[PDB]
Amino acid sequence: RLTTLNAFVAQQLVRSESAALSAQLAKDKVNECVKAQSKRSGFCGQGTHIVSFVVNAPNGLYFMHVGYYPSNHIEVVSAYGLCDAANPTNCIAPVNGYFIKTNNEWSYTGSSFYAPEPITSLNTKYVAPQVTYQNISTNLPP
Amino acid sequence: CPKLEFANDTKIASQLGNCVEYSLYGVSGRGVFQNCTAVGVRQQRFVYDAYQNLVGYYSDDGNYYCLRACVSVPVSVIYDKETKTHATLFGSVACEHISSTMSQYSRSTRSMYGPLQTPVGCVLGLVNSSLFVEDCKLPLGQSLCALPDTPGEMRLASIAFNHPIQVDQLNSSYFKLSIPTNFSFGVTQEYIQTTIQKVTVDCKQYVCNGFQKCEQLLREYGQFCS
Amino acid sequence: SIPTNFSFGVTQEYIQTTIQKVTVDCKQYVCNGFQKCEQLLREYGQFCSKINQALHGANLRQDDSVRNLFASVKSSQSSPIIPGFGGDFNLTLLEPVARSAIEDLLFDKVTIADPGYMQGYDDCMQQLICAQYVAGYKVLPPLMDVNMEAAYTSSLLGSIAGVGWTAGLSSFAAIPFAQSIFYRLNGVGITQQVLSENQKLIANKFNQALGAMQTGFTTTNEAFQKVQDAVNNNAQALSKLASELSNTFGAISASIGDIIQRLDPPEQDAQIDRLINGRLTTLNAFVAQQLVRSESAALSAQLAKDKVNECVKAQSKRSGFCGQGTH
Amino acid sequence: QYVAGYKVLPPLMDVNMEAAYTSSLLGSIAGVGWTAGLSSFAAIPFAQS
Amino acid sequence: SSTMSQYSRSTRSMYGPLQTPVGCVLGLVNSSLFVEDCKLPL
Amino acid sequence: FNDLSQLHCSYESFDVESGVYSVSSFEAKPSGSVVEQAEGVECDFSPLLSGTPPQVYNFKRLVFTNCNYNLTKLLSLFSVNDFTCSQISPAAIASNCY
Amino acid sequence: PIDVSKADGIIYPQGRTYSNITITYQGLFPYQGDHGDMYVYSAGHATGTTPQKLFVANYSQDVKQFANGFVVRIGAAANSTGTVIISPSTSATIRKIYPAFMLGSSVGNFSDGKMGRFFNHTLVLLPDGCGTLLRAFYCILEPRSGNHCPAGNSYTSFATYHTPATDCSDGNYNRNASLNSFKEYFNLRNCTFMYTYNITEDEILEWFGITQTAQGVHLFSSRYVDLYGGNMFQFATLPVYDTIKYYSIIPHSIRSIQSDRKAWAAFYVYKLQPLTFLLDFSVDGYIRRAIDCG
Ligand SMILES: *[C@@H]1O[C@H](CO)[C@@H](O)[C@H](O)[C@H]1NC(C)=O
Ligand SMILES: *[C@@H]1O[C@H](CO)[C@@H](O)[C@H](O)[C@H]1NC(C)=O
Ligand SMILES: *[C@@H]1O[C@H](CO)[C@@H](O)[C@H](O)[C@H]1NC(C)=O
Ligand SMILES: *[C@@H]1O[C@H](CO)[C@@H](O)[C@H](O)[C@H]1NC(C)=O
Ligand SMILES: *[C@@H]1O[C@H](CO)[C@@H](O)[C@H](O)[C@H]1NC(C)=O
Ligand SMILES: *[C@@H]1O[C@H](CO)[C@@H](O)[C@H](O)[C@H]1NC(C)=O
Ligand SMILES: *[C@@H]1O[C@H](CO)[C@@H](O)[C@H](O)[C@H]1NC(C)=O
Ligand SMILES: *[C@@H]1O[C@H](CO)[C@@H](O)[C@H](O)[C@H]1NC(C)=O
Ligand SMILES: *[C@@H]1O[C@H](CO)[C@@H](O)[C@H](O)[C@H]1NC(C)=O
């Protein structure tokens, strides 16, 4: 009786460090992408996570991530960066996005979905050029 | 060991290349034989591995024989759970053994033995079918699987690879982009055993049930329960 | 105080992810088809059935962990491996072209015997791993083909050559590896024009940095030793079946067939009882050890997924996250 | 413990030198804790830091 | 090495003045040098 | 017993689902036997069968190796009152070997 | 010193061996690099050619504990040139010689009170025929009552003689010379057996071992198997009826001439005690790298 109680306490102990690490990780989870919205890849939610939800349970915690998942991938033509031939130091680097040529000509699209929209200063930065960039002089952003 | 009638079918050559049993006058078990040149000390004839298993033997004619032992078929059987399709898989072996020479207790062929040679080995109970299922949850080793589908037999399939959308790398300043044009909201749900049920018990009821002779005898170990 | 000379050192880190999914049998391993053992194993029963169901569940946990880490490393979009990748970068050892050269020399350098995945019985026929029946257990072929793994490695390799520029884990805009690592060096805080007046010099020091390790793959590099230590721990795990048949633990002999061929029923009852308790306790401790290593492998594979998600497909932010100092 | 028949292993490195590490860290966190980078040293006065 | 026990241990050619912060050393020689790349921590 | 009860040898099951049960029980059964090591002549146990049986404090022992033993011609010349064996068996006089 | 890492003096395993594996194994082992029980064999005195008085030692009255067997090295100093033991002014070549063994569980005093007398049945081993024969008997020794005999008057010590002009000539071997040389002092009673062994003669140094246990006396020699290597390989099993607790070496002398006194090697004897080694067997199966645990 007592040595299967020894065993019982011993495996209770094992589940105790298991649940201690589990509780540490779980409170980390409810901190990172539940309170704020962190930028880790799959660390709390599979796929590109957006929103998370937390519910208690009589032996732990259940977590609900709802996140964007892509579909219908198609080929378009983007760019890397546009700098003037006469003024190489002026470049536009899209903040969290990519280029497109549609000519409704260079315009902006996000990093997730086919959402083209024209070149705006509000979602780009200025960085020094490199040897492998693109030059144009016929139609330029403000 | 005591003597026996020998005849021809007792030599190493009489059972070369066969999964047989061996009795090297006390060193007994089940072994295989393969013809090999003189390895190790000739005078010993009893050479063991790092884990106390005979690895060879010098025969009387001077031919050495590697003892790789009577390794069986590498045994597996699969059953598609509670859809009545179960069939057996033989790891990395030809179909040189068939549904005749078994033992154990028995084996049920059900309907109608029959080679299903595959990269995992030799399968019995399947039929060849070049099927490609990516999301299958019934793997058969390496890249082998089976189709759930919707009184017959069970068909073969492969663990398919979902090829990514291929985009050609361009050394030119122009480049081609691969973009998703449709979006969804996948739900990833997880559970964490943050709290265990906080269960306790004492030594006088679980271990003693309040019996007085038990109560006085329990104090000999005493502080153990404490 | 800022230095005027810089090199690229190479840090080598190995993390064990997947224990070989070994399975062991109530019937064949324990009993080996002996009739008194046949009629005595059943009233024990639930013990070995519970532990083999437990190892089945742990193996399935490992399998689903492997599936999850493949889902993590499966890039939605990828680029084919091209001839002359990197331009001036002679990255011939890293390229995959069935199998990649670097992991091939790692396979050769690490003391590995072939685990007979295609002609294992034929390998036993013509000439340790073949003792898989001799001790008695069965490890499955892995969840993936070697080409399935090759596709995964090529996919992640193609992805990280392009996703080192801009966040967003959906679209792929693969940069050439040169311009990619120029922008990476801009990310770590080095201006472009010093790199841009020294293309050949940075390329040459980059190539000698990437040629350093296969020359340095020896006893000095601790990562190769810990790879071999993981392999030796798997070897000790299988030895914990192999030697323990010989370990009588108060019994007489390892050969259960000789045990039953010698001993009379009124004494082989107690002797086979000694055998079964010794073997059941050893397997209990064994499955305990690899279940502990199972959650260790789960957390380690999760951390490895994080490592390939942070300092492989992006620019890291933790100080010395995966490299000694400035990775 | 030697009476008990075992030996705890002593610190293989001295107390004053982990003190030196901790002092170095106290100096360092001012330098690194202003702009990202691990190369140089940027010791702000700790008031301003 | 006077009041010993167990079975056997020997020493090569010359109990030097080796009184260190860890204790006392046998088989070395006094030399205070700097090692910033120590691999076998004494 | 058959193939499917062998799967369901621990619990009870039902109709239609997906699930892997790679647990198994069979083996590739032997079909051959070898009984040699080299050769062997018979060790003479007549020195036990002859001579004066000495006292218990002066017991006479004989060792046998690298030969043959035939128990069929030995116990036939015996009248055994009792035959007990601590952690070995009386039945293993000429079946197993050492 | 005897170096186990130099593969000097490791007993071959009894009934199982390995190949290219490193593994520990218990057994009976000596101590690494010992002084041993070094004895040298010197020829007797000579005045020209005629047979004269002996030239031997007090090693006939010195005893060491048998423990758990002992091993003897043969010809280690041979194939060289050193000073002759009896003639210090003479420097001659060094030739291998083989030792005679006496074994028992009792040590007593001789007729003159010197210790070394053995009671009950005694195990006597003797090389003979210029070392070709390996005669032995676990039988009863009987000293005689003559002059300079262990049961007779004027007793000092005991040894064995050798006349190689009559023994080590072409063929001959002089009616087992060395056996009758030992029997020139002694007689045999209550005897059990007489075993001979057939060993060639050369000038390559060799190992030897002798032990006893519940399954008899066992003798290990490398002459039968390994010459270019060398390990104590089991060759002889002797039917002993008890356990032996003491061992000693019979000194041997030679009826040499005075002018061309050729000396012999100083053989070494090492005792055996329960211990464990570590053995690194290569692919050949010969013991070429082993080491102690203690
Ligand atoms: C299974 O069928 C396909 C298509 O006919 C064939 O290519 C393949 O070789 C077959 N498998 C075997 C093992 O023959
Ligand atoms: C996106 O895919 C889902 C999948 O069924 C579909 O229901 C939906 O209509 C699609 N949306 C667009 C805009 O194509
Ligand atoms: C940096 O040091 C290395 C190693 O000595 C040397 O080869 C290289 O030229 C140095 N570079 C500079 C810029 O000093
Ligand atoms: C690239 O590296 C490989 C391996 O070191 C070498 O064989 C090859 O010649 C190299 N090629 C160039 C162009 O440097
Ligand atoms: C070595 O010599 C110096 C100078 O005399 C002394 O300060 C130091 O304590 C010595 N070290 C040891 C270990 O004796
Ligand atoms: C014996 O072991 C060594 C050490 O690994 C190895 O290099 C050698 O190839 C082995 N011998 C054979 C014949 O394989
Ligand atoms: C050899 O010695 C034996 C003693 O055992 C003796 O009987 C025999 O005569 C000797 N040989 C010759 C040729 O005399
Ligand atoms: C041999 O010695 C034993 C031991 O005392 C003795 O019993 C026996 O009679 C002796 N044999 C003789 C004297 O022939
Ligand atoms: C012993 O050796 C001699 C050497 O000439 C040989 O003639 C003789 O036949 C050998 N005898 C045995 C029994 O081996």
Side-chain angles (χ1 to χ4, degrees):
Chain A
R1 209 130 54 248
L2 211 51
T3 200
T4 55
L5 273 200
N6 288 163
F8 196 63
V9 175
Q11 62 111 7
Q12 228 84 179
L13 162 53
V14 168
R15 296 196 329 280
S16 77
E17 74 265 10
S18 178
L21 295 196
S22 312
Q24 169 63 254
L25 184 62
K27 77 188 166 66
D28 291 331
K29 292 296 204 84
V30 311
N31 290 318
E32 48 174 2
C33 55
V34 176
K35 300 290 94 176
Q37 216 188 15
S38 168
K39 272 74 61 180
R40 325 278 72 72
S41 161
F43 182 76
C44 66
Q46 288 312 119
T48 58
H49 156 268
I50 316 298
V51 189
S52 307
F53 293 98
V54 181
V55 287
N56 296 115
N59 51 4
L61 271 295
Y62 202 91
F63 292 165
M64 284 74 74
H65 308 264
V66 187
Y68 151 67
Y69 265 71
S71 62
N72 294 114
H73 313 79
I74 208 66
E75 286 296 326
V76 287
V77 175
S78 62
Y80 297 169
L82 275 296
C83 319
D84 175 39
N87 311 276
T89 180
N90 189 359
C91 298
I92 43 168
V95 167
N96 198 0
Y98 303 98
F99 293 99
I100 193 66
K101 277 85 71 174
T102 304
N103 193 18
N104 193 247
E105 170 54 51
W106 292 270
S107 295
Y108 176 80
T109 309
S111 279
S112 308
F113 160 75
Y114 176 69
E117 62 86 20
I119 292 178
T120 65
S121 77
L122 295 174
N123 206 5
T124 181
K125 77 158 186 187
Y126 293 81
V127 71
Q130 286 175 38
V131 75
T132 51
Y133 264 111
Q134 190 69 81
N135 306 278
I136 200 58
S137 171
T138 175
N139 267 305
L140 277 298
Chain B
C1 290
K3 68 155 286 188
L4 190 63
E5 175 46 65
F6 293 99
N8 204 306
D9 204 72
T10 45
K11 216 180 304 181
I12 297 169
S14 78
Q15 287 171 177
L16 59 89
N18 295 131
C19 216
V20 296
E21 84 94 39
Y22 64 94
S23 48
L24 276 296
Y25 272 46
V27 189
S28 300
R30 46 198 297 169
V32 300
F33 292 161
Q34 202 269 327
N35 191 17
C36 304
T37 187
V39 175
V41 163
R42 196 264 312 157
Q43 195 58 43
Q44 172 59 252
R45 290 96 60 186
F46 292 164
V47 298
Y48 293 99
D49 69 326
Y51 323 109
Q52 287 69 240
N53 297 115
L54 189 75
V55 294
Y57 168 67
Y58 280 94
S59 178
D60 299 335
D61 48 10
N63 282 93
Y64 182 76
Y65 293 97
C66 302
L67 271 292
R68 210 53 184 168
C70 190
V71 54
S72 85
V73 64
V75 165
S76 64
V77 70
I78 193 50
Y79 175 48
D80 292 331
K81 183 47 175 176
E82 86 187 9
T83 75
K84 316 293 260 187
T85 49
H86 53 287
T88 177
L89 283 72
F90 292 168
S92 86
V93 75
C95 298
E96 82 263 13
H97 192 280
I98 210 64
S99 297
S100 66
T101 58
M102 292 66 58
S103 171
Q104 201 195 359
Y105 164 70
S106 286
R107 188 186 168 274
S108 163
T109 74
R110 279 91 59 195
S111 50
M112 182 179 72
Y113 162 65
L116 276 297
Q117 302 271 55
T118 58
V120 302
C122 168
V123 190
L124 319 180
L126 270 296
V127 58
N128 179 30
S129 52
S130 186
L131 310 183
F132 297 95
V133 177
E134 52 164 4
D135 309 326
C136 75
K137 293 290 295 180
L138 273 297
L140 294 174
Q142 314 160 349
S143 279
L144 277 297
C145 195
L147 180 61
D149 213 359
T150 291
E153 280 86 59
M154 183 46 217
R155 311 163 318 279
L156 275 162
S158 83
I159 302 176
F161 164 63
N162 200 354
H163 287 87
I165 297 89
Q166 208 66 255
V167 54
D168 179 69
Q169 174 53 243
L170 294 174
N171 50 356
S172 88
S173 171
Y174 273 20
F175 194 63
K176 43 169 82 70
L177 178 61
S178 186
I179 190 67
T181 78
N182 186 12
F183 64 95
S184 62
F185 307 117
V187 286
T188 292
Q189 277 66 240
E190 65 262 37
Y191 191 76
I192 297 89
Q193 51 274 16
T194 76
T195 317
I196 193 66
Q197 42 173 21
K198 320 164 301 171
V199 192
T200 53
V201 75
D202 192 358
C203 185
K204 283 299 179 176
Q205 185 53 230
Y206 182 76
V207 194
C208 194
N209 291 132
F211 293 100
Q212 282 70 239
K213 186 252 188 195
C214 176
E215 273 192 71
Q216 51 88 18
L217 277 193
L218 187 148
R219 288 275 83 85
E220 265 79 5
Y221 291 165
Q223 74 283 321
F224 280 19
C225 308
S226 79
Chain C
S1 176
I2 188 158
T4 187
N5 199 353
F6 65 97
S7 76
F8 288 168
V10 188
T11 309
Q12 317 185 354
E13 198 188 6
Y14 165 67
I15 296 89
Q16 188 274 331
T17 67
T18 61
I19 297 89
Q20 304 93 332
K21 64 182 181 293
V22 62
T23 61
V24 68
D25 190 23
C26 284
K27 184 72 175 179
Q28 169 50 232
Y29 156 70
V30 166
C31 184
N32 300 131
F34 306 140
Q35 83 303 359
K36 176 142 182 300
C37 170
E38 290 264 336
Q39 62 91 208
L40 276 194
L41 66 94
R42 301 165 88 184
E43 62 90 17
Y44 287 104
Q46 69 273 337
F47 313 130
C48 73
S49 76
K50 176 77 148 205
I51 63 170
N52 60 54
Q53 269 209 339
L55 62 83
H56 201 319
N59 279 310
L60 291 190
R61 262 202 192 88
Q62 185 181 6
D63 291 331
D64 278 3
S65 74
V66 162
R67 292 186 184 92
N68 193 18
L69 62 84
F70 290 166
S72 180
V73 299
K74 205 266 161 189
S75 79
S76 170
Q77 305 141 337
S78 168
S79 165
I81 43 174
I82 61 165
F85 189 47
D88 205 76
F89 304 145
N90 190 54
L91 210 55
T92 52
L93 183 62
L94 191 140
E95 61 88 20
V97 74
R99 37 200 205 276
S100 183
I102 181 64
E103 50 91 14
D104 281 340
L105 61 84
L106 294 174
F107 207 102
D108 202 355
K109 182 153 288 192
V110 176
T111 314
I112 312 162
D114 166 73
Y117 291 129
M118 187 66 204
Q119 291 90 20
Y121 193 84
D122 309 342
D123 290 327
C124 293
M125 183 278 288
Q126 53 96 28
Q127 201 265 333
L128 197 50
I129 303 185
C130 190
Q132 188 177 177
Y133 181 76
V134 176
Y137 43 71
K138 176 33 181 73
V139 61
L140 276 295
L143 293 94
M144 73 292 291
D145 198 272
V146 296
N147 305 300
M148 187 66 203
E149 176 274 347
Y152 270 131
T153 48
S154 309
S155 69
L156 58 93
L157 183 63
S159 71
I160 62 170
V163 301
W165 197 292
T166 290
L169 307 167
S170 308
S171 58
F172 193 37
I175 302 299
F177 205 68
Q179 175 195 349
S180 83
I181 62 170
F182 292 108
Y183 204 50
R184 281 198 69 80
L185 277 183
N186 296 115
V188 306
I190 313 168
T191 181
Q192 49 89 26
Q193 69 275 16
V194 57
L195 280 298
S196 315
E197 61 97 18
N198 304 307
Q199 293 82 17
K200 193 57 173 185
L201 301 181
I202 68 153
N204 293 353
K205 61 96 173 181
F206 182 76
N207 296 295
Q208 63 84 30
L210 276 296
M213 71 305 297
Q214 85 279 354
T215 60
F217 280 160
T218 177
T219 61
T220 74
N221 278 345
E222 196 45 60
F224 162 64
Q225 283 71 242
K226 65 178 72 66
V227 175
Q228 204 74 78
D229 291 331
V231 176
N232 196 14
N233 264 352
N234 316 129
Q236 183 62 255
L238 60 90
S239 84
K240 276 186 166 70
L241 277 296
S243 58
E244 274 66 7
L245 270 299
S246 69
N247 296 115
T248 67
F249 292 165
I252 311 303
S253 290
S255 170
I256 308 105
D258 291 331
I259 288 292
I260 191 167
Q261 190 188 3
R262 291 183 290 113
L263 303 173
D264 304 344
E267 57 184 359
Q268 85 188 330
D269 62 358
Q271 198 46 262
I272 297 169
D273 291 331
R274 291 164 84 99
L275 294 174
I276 192 66
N277 319 289
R279 68 185 49 231
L280 70 86
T281 61
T282 48
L283 272 295
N284 290 318
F286 173 93
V287 299
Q289 287 208 322
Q290 301 91 38
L291 72 88
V292 168
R293 224 191 200 181
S294 78
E295 73 284 332
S296 178
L299 61 85
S300 79
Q302 187 67 34
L303 183 63
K305 148 178 172 188
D306 304 328
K307 285 184 182 294
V308 308
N309 279 330
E310 166 164 359
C311 77
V312 175
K313 60 174 61 49
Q315 185 69 46
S316 159
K317 274 85 199 164
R318 186 172 67 86
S319 171
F321 161 72
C322 71
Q324 305 306 129
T326 308
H327 171 268
Chain D
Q1 47 190 273
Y2 202 91
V3 176
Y6 67 93
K7 176 59 173 51
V8 311
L9 275 297
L12 274 294
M13 70 293 292
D14 203 342
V15 64
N16 52 352
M17 61 80 71
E18 302 105 10
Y21 292 100
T22 46
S23 67
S24 68
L25 294 174
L26 165 59
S28 78
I29 62 170
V32 56
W34 166 59
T35 300
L38 316 176
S39 299
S40 85
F41 191 66
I44 305 298
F46 293 99
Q48 185 196 356
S49 165
Chain E
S1 309
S2 64
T3 76
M4 295 298 102
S5 82
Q6 64 100 30
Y7 306 108
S8 167
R9 185 260 175 189
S10 176
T11 302
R12 289 268 65 74
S13 165
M14 185 180 288
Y15 320 122
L18 305 180
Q19 177 49 46
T20 60
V22 300
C24 183
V25 192
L26 191 149
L28 271 296
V29 71
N30 191 5
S31 56
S32 183
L33 276 297
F34 303 144
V35 190
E36 308 272 32
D37 291 321
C38 195
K39 304 208 299 301
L40 315 182
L42 198 40
Chain F
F1 78 102
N2 51 7
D3 274 326
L4 193 63
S5 64
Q6 278 159 6
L7 274 296
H8 312 108
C9 66
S10 51
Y11 55 85
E12 202 262 0
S13 291
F14 295 105
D15 181 58
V16 176
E17 88 176 17
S18 73
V20 184
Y21 281 89
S22 296
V23 291
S24 194
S25 67
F26 56 87
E27 193 273 331
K29 314 302 185 308
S31 56
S33 86
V34 289
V35 287
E36 287 88 351
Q37 68 97 25
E39 64 265 11
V41 77
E42 158 83 4
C43 281
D44 198 29
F45 314 121
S46 308
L48 180 136
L49 294 149
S50 174
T52 291
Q55 287 303 310
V56 55
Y57 44 84
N58 288 341
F59 51 89
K60 186 168 174 64
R61 74 281 191 191
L62 322 170
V63 65
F64 313 102
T65 315
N66 301 294
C67 76
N68 196 292
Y69 54 93
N70 190 6
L71 269 293
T72 68
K73 315 283 163 290
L74 183 63
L75 268 291
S76 57
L77 322 172
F78 286 166
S79 160
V80 168
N81 318 125
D82 213 6
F83 184 13
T84 77
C85 295
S86 187
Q87 48 86 27
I88 192 66
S89 77
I93 48 170
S95 69
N96 291 99
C97 295
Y98 280 86
Chain G
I2 288 305
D3 187 19
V4 189
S5 75
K6 265 194 61 48
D8 312 319
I10 297 89
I11 297 97
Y12 198 75
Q14 49 273 11
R16 82 173 280 180
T17 189
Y18 302 98
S19 175
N20 218 7
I21 311 298
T22 69
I23 197 57
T24 63
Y25 175 46
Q26 63 84 30
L28 295 175
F29 304 120
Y31 277 137
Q32 148 74 50
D34 301 334
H35 299 285
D37 285 329
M38 65 184 74
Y39 315 127
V40 73
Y41 277 170
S42 186
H45 278 302
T47 55
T49 308
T50 66
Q52 304 308 127
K53 188 263 290 179
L54 292 171
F55 186 91
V56 298
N58 211 1
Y59 291 143
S60 48
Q61 282 84 11
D62 308 329
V63 65
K64 295 293 183 182
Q65 165 58 223
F66 195 11
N68 313 96
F70 67 100
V71 286
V72 176
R73 189 68 180 269
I74 296 304
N79 274 312
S80 175
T81 288
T83 174
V84 184
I85 316 296
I86 179 178
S87 181
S89 64
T90 313
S91 295
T93 177
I94 314 177
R95 200 176 280 101
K96 58 164 69 170
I97 204 162
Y98 313 99
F101 288 176
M102 62 80 71
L103 279 82
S105 289
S106 177
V107 178
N109 55 345
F110 292 137
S111 184
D112 44 357
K114 225 160 167 196
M115 294 299 291
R117 180 67 180 270
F118 273 51
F119 212 84
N120 297 124
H121 271 90
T122 57
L123 186 63
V124 184
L125 290 86
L126 178 139
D128 202 347
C130 316
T132 43
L133 291 151
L134 282 73
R135 318 299 202 99
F137 51 94
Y138 185 59
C139 299
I140 295 276
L141 59 93
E142 175 187 294
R144 67 185 69 188
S145 49
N147 47 0
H148 299 280
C149 313
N153 47 331
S154 72
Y155 178 46
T156 59
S157 295
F158 78 104
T160 53
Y161 55 85
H162 186 193
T163 314
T166 69
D167 174 79
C168 277
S169 57
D170 44 352
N172 296 115
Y173 294 154
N174 204 23
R175 83 294 163 271
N176 50 54
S178 178
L179 192 139
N180 296 154
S181 170
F182 182 76
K183 268 200 60 67
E184 211 270 333
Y185 294 99
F186 269 20
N187 295 326
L188 261 65
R189 255 86 162 162
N190 213 344
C191 205
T192 47
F193 44 75
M194 201 36 49
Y195 293 101
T196 62
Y197 295 91
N198 211 352
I199 284 299
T200 70
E201 303 316 298
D202 62 330
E203 206 62 32
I204 313 172
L205 74 165
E206 65 182 1
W207 274 105
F208 170 76
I210 171 168
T211 187
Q212 71 98 29
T213 178
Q215 54 269 17
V217 176
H218 311 294
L219 266 70
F220 292 69
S221 169
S222 169
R223 188 74 188 150
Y224 295 84
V225 176
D226 215 359
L227 187 145
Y228 269 93
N231 299 127
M232 283 74 74
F233 272 100
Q234 166 64 41
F235 84 100
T237 294
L238 277 296
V240 76
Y241 208 73
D242 60 338
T243 65
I244 297 89
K245 191 266 184 182
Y246 298 110
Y247 83 108
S248 293
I249 307 300
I250 296 91
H252 176 75
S253 176
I254 296 91
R255 297 284 74 78
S256 178
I257 62 170
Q258 198 173 19
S259 177
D260 205 358
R261 298 180 156 160
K262 303 170 186 298
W264 305 90
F267 57 91
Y268 280 60
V269 169
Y270 302 95
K271 277 161 60 187
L272 275 294
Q273 57 268 11
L275 183 62
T276 61
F277 290 173
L278 170 66
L279 59 85
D280 301 1
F281 284 173
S282 66
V283 294
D284 62 342
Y286 292 165
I287 309 168
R288 300 305 150 232
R289 221 179 62 174
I291 191 166
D292 198 356
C293 77

